[PDB]
Every structure is written in C-alpha cells, then in structure tokens.
Amino acid sequence: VGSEVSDKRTCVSLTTQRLPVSRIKTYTITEGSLRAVIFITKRGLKVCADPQATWVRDVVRSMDRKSNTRNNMIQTKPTGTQQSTNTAVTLTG
Template identity: 75%
Template sequence: MRLLILAILAICCLGAYIVEGVGSEVPDRSVCVSLHTRPLPVQKIKSYTIKEGSMKAVIFITKRGLKICADPQAKWVKSAVRSMDKKSTTRRNMVQTEPTGAQQSTNTAVTLTG
C-alpha cells in the first residue's frame, strides 16, 4: 500500500514539474500596473527597457534582478536613462580589438651560404 502511495505521489510531482516547464515557454510579458515615483540610484540599475502600450513606462532592471516601472516623463527617469546610455557607450568604446594577421609579427630566418 505504501508503495502505491509513493508511486502516485511521484507521478503527481513529475506532472507538476512537466506542467511548470511548459508554462515557462510562454514569452515574457512585462506589464506595469503602477509606476515607481521615488528616484532610484543609478548605481543599482543594471539595464532598462522601454515599454509602449496602454501604460508607457521605463522598466529598470536592478543588479538584484528586480523590475521597477517608472514614468518615462519624470526628470529622474530621463536622467537615469541618459546615464545608462552613457555607460554603455563608454564600455563599447573601451573594448580592445585583437590584432589582425597583417599586424602580427612574423619571424623569417635567412641562411647565408658562401
């Protein structure tokens, strides 16, 4: 009897795991219900996205992974977006490139016989 109960419990757990996996394939929809009004420190922001629709919003993603919706017309939001854009431009410009084949040094030895 215990074996039957364990088997049924295992099947239920497996079914819940499979259903959860199927649900995770649904595309991520970020919907803002309300807008954050207090300024968010730029140091805590990892990235942002801009959502258009019934409620226009800037969604800040913090370094901890939290999504915070904010009013795109707010002064602090515009400043944070400019700051994030400036950081990404600076990082892109600082990337060093690998030397190409023409730039790499080649050593050729010449043997003189005489």
C-alpha cells in the same frame, strides 16, 4: 516576507522609489499602452517608472551608457541537464 503576485504584470506601481542608477543595471521602455520605463537592478529586481519624470529621463540617458556595452559584457548562458557515473556503496548491518 513577500508581496502580492499574480495580479501585477512587471512591477508594482510607477516609480515612487528613486533608485540609484549606480544600483540599476539595464532598463526597458515601452511604447504600447504600457508606455513606461522599466528599470532593472543588479539584484535582478525590475520596476516600472513614468517617462514623464525628468530625473528618470536623465537617468535613462545615463542608463544607456551604464549598460551600453555591459549588456554584451554579460551573456548568462543557461543549461539543460548534466550527466554522471553510477555509484555503489553499502553500509554495514
């Protein structure tokens, strides 16, 4: 139950899995050697896709709208550590 890691970078391959935008959350397109479109799903699963795909470009257009303001609508704020009080309870014996 799992795949190979340490080798990959961001995803596995380029596309090969026409994911429904409805399931996709946000995306990230690169311009560097990568020059690939990254698709992030609500499941936190991010994949890569070729921007040469028309369907992709079409979804990319919507993706922006799908996550136009949403991006802001979501601002996961992580935490460091927490505090607590001391305890004291002994068991008979």
